[model samples]
Target chain A: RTWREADINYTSGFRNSDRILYSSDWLIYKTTDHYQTFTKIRCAQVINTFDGVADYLQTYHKLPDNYITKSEAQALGWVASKGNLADVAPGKSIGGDIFSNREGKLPGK
Target chain B: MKKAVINGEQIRSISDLHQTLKKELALPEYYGENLDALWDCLTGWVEYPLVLEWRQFEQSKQLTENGAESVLQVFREAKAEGCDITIILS
Candidate 1:
């Protein structure tokens, strides 16, 4: 019953499907919206497409290199709630943020 | 700040709602689990910022009818009068 996970980027420029969930034992799931719904990411079938990602998690306990924290964006005058995260950061998006399981919709941590 | 969520989605009766409020609010040992005591104890708890999210409110209304609304009304009035309370109905 123990599950651990983190959210990753799906869409390149803060777009839909840009956020994905990855976890311990590598349980993969993604959400389009902010905790609205989650879509399971199939591992075995889509190896090459997602394998580029697991390499980072497999090695570093931290998030992948492409990820950026919102506080990091603020140094460049980026606004978090204003939806202009990409406007300031360019190409990259926010990560290592909280995804609340307000309704017990998400798995473990 | 006090943050608590009460989901009455699976609740079937007024008694079910009462049990949820008792646990979520942590009402007094002597507090009545009825309308009169719900207002007294609930309003008393919020001296600071409070977010009380009531999920599946439509289902709660459907099940408890007028009884559910009575609890909601207490929440509404308490918030409006002088309580630092916010009720999120979902």
Candidate 2:
């Protein structure tokens, strides 16, 4: 639930705005004092607000910007072959993996 | 002739940067709290051949995109001065 997003800004906000967590969905947002100040950004998730816009259409299909995928991260000395990226980048996780709903809990219809 | 490391996790704002740098660079009490001032000190005050490694650069970039860019610009400008300050981002 505290996943990171490429489009989100982790640092921008009011004073002492040190922590922010978000994913691809703009609806969910959380924060911390680097500890616990978790809060919500919105109540409802907007599925397709820009379904009618051509500009949105062009960029919607691609992975968000600033996201360093496994392949792209490899050149930067990330050794996924060895194991998790913890050893390479220290605090970074390998992003851009295709979502597959492995739990099979989402409605299929 | 020396090297220093700044952890990205500890950075939150430009002031955090100034604090970290003062410890490494021995910045003066009058060090101006701005990127332009940082560049001035980095190029003229600090000694040459210094290695400054910024770990978790991506995280820092995300947390403080504009701030990170400004700091990196200082490093770039310092390099252009032929100060021999090697900056490595990890």
Candidate 3:
């Protein structure tokens, strides 16, 4: 399913700047125009912590941040009824999902 | 064996594309302003071993996506028929 961008206008003079990259995950992005200009919105913040022993943390560390995920969205009254995510969670930022090109419409470089 | 350049910035529609191709290829008056006729001329009338370059293709493609694809398809068909037609999008 496709979801339209939220009402929080990011760019001026262009109404349809917002685009949902991953509808399944409520991952939204914005483009002011065609390939003429480009910009990415950092929807969430990140955290970093070093190991106490050697200040080198190996493996993986998933820090919690803003931007509602798929599961979180489902928990927050988000249903398939409407395409917009922020429709349910009014205050939360919409669309920070990584685009997985499963459709193969995009050619590999 | 020859290079032909079409400035896509000037082409806004299929009619524009056809007119440009007609002028560039020096196609006969009987040539139809359509993809099928384009193929017929390129294969049977115009000289082969040709390289056709389209400049500002993205803009042209936006104007007529299906038309542009049809033009490319003609080039591909010409190549398949041993015409040595090459398509370059810029």
Candidate 4:
């Protein structure tokens, strides 16, 4: 039992909830650290967040991709929502299953 | 510069070179009837490649992929009504 809606800037609370549905038993694919190496990307059956997948459909419809960019994420205070057909980008809030590492760079991490 | 007519339908390009009865019609079946040979033959008589191409153009412009093939059926529907289609594009 999961919520179904088309929101790219999803809540982390929701992501935490979905994680319960995807236990450690699922495959975990982490990319190789070396610049030139191969590592399999892993995924679970439940998808609560959206970005690469959201942009896939967005590009198909010829929409903007900057919504997933970093500039827009910071302006949104890291927890924002987007309106229908709304353009997500710099100088505004951002949301979703995105996290920043030590470099202060937001990785789908 | 070239000419060929299969059954009563005229063919002008490699797109139409495939056998009308000897080869399979790999039509992008967006759906409707499975389209038997007689139906293909009858529709081909109206306009082969040109009509098919026009249908594709209209489909991409007007309707979604799932219902694009239905646009071609409109031509047959007009034929059934004895309506002149020479000016369809006009």
Candidate 5:
């Protein structure tokens, strides 16, 4: 199983710094500092929401297409240190890039 | 030839990282809870033929995003600065 990151907050100008990198098994990691650090969290019970994203991934086994990658965001001059995807990559949310679990925290090939 | 090791498996937090750095490398009392200070010693106090072996490095990576990476960045910097420091990440 693989994990992906997605935005939990956003609007017009900049995207939400609060995003999650979750796996098909519902393993989630939230980071506020551009993957600088993360704290594990659980899923929630609604749509268009952070925990809701978890529900979707657990069921559909993939993040909603709104997610974008750090590399993708960087190409847009998005150095807030940076931020807010839609305004930069529009339509695409911040996730779906491979969340590399090099530590064997979860099983992978 | 100089040598040091920061056991990644033994490190569970920033405190642990610094603790291990001090213990394994014989770093003085002035160290702890400081990556910048650690780097200063490595780049300055630590000398050539420096073989810094990082055991169970991925464990530290999972413990903290970029924690494993942070040390590696410093190691590379030392390597480039003419230390011939060899970094072994296992």
Candidate 6:
């Protein structure tokens, strides 16, 4: 799984700063673009992603905070529960649902 | 002992070998004496037909940064050479 930090924050409640600093020092996996990747994402990324999700649930979903922050919050648990998105590519992107439709391919395969 | 490359240069000894693995594997922590256990764990999870394996682990001693890279080098080389290796973490 190779999801970006962007997606993880929307689902998990971990702060971005904390995750960048803490969690594991080195990413478990490395991307083709020359950055390290991880099997497990930082807890902070999880938090920020959740906040974004909470906002979405309030707007389009029209769900309450309770509904948004639920333990099984798909948005927050997307990465923490499912781990990184294998579809995600390296580096940052302003691109659209490319994140969702992503999958990882091992090198030398 | 065969010549190996690291960061573009050829490796001729244990120290050189260490640098090569450090650049490639990037293992955070490692134990050098009990690599067999580590090999089992890795093989159990990964689908790739791991070509090589190398490792060592010592439960009683602290696994230092140097030790970390050394063991990973063993594994990476094993993979490269098509050998399956492992290291026990504690």
Candidate 3 regions exceeding 4 Å error are A1-109
Q: What is the lDDT of candidate 4?
A: 0.27
lDDT of 4 by residue, B1-90 (tens): 112223312323222323332232332221112222123222322222222223223323333333323433544554564533432221
Pairwise lDDT winner, candidates 3 and 6: 3
Global lDDT of model 6: 0.28
Tens digits of per-residue lDDT, candidate 3, A1-109, equal: 4322221232222112223222333322333331122233334432311111011111122211324544365567554223344566654543333332322222221
Residue B59 C-alpha lDDT in model 6: 23
| Chain A TM-scores in order | 0.60, 0.31, 0.32, 0.21, 0.56, 0.19
Residue runs of model 4 more than 4 Å from their true location after superposition:
A1-10, A13-66, A79-109, B1-90
Off by over 4 Å in 5: A1-109
For model 6, residues A6-71, the per-residue Cα lDDT tens digits are: 222222222121111111122222121212232332233424443443344334533223222211
* Residue-by-residue lDDT tens digits, candidate 1, A1-109: 2233333543433233234556555565555443345666655543553444545555675676666654465567654224465677666655554333323455666
lDDT of 5 by residue, B1-90 (tens): 767787777777866776777676665454533554454455434435678888888888877555768767767876785657888889
Model 2 residue runs over 4 Å out of place are: A1-109
Better of 3 and 4 by TM-score: 3
Global Cα RMSD, each model: 13.4, 16.7, 18.6, 19.9, 11.4, 15.4
**Once model 2 is optimally superposed onto the true structure by TM-score, how far is the C-alpha of residue B35 displaced, in angstroms?**
1.1
In angstroms, the error of model 2 at A106 is: 56
Q: Using lDDT as the measure, what is the rank order of every candidate, best first?
A: 5, 1, 2, 3, 6, 4
lDDT of 1 by residue, B2-89 (tens): 7768786877888788778877776544444565445534433333467889998888888886578878887877778666788899
lDDT of candidate 3 over B15-74, digit per residue (tens): 788788878777665455665456535543565568899898778877875577777777
Model 2 TM-score relative to the real fold: 0.43
Worst lDDT 10-window in candidate 4 chain A:
A14-23
